[PDB]
Amino acid sequence: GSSGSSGLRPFNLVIPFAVQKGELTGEVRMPSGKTARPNITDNKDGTITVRYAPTEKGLHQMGIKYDGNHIPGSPLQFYVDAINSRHSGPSSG
């Protein structure tokens, strides 16, 4: 296709998994032929936030772990498509 302005929406998801006295690690695999380490924001409230910035569009493989144990929900598949232009959905207070 084209080479430059790709634009790919970020990956923001919250998995129901508590985390207090443990480390949560993960990894992403792009269809290009490489791998990039995702991001996790431990809330220590009973859930975890996953943030990943895809560079290419396609099916990516995300494999998370917990102190050496496949968290309840990983790995997970997430497709990446070009960022939309417009979208309905007003905000409220």
Side-chain angles (χ1 to χ4, degrees):
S2 73
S3 63
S5 200
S6 295
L8 313 167
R9 278 185 59 275
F11 195 61
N12 37 46
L13 166 63
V14 181
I15 307 165
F17 194 47
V19 181
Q20 309 89 9
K21 292 288 274 294
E23 171 63 49
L24 210 90
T25 50
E27 166 176 305
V28 178
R29 158 59 167 200
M30 65 190 82
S32 280
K34 319 191 286 292
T35 61
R37 207 201 286 287
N39 270 75
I40 303 151
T41 309
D42 190 7
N43 311 291
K44 293 84 86 199
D45 206 298
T47 76
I48 66 166
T49 290
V50 182
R51 270 165 89 72
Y52 163 62
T55 306
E56 204 66 50
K57 66 196 193 176
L59 202 72
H60 294 75
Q61 202 170 294
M62 174 177 292
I64 309 304
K65 270 270 175 167
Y66 181 80
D67 210 44
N69 184 104
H70 266 286
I71 59 160
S74 92
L76 57 88
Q77 285 170 310
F78 65 106
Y79 193 71
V80 180
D81 70 86
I83 302 168
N84 294 112
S85 304
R86 71 153 176 156
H87 175 59
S88 73
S91 182
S92 71

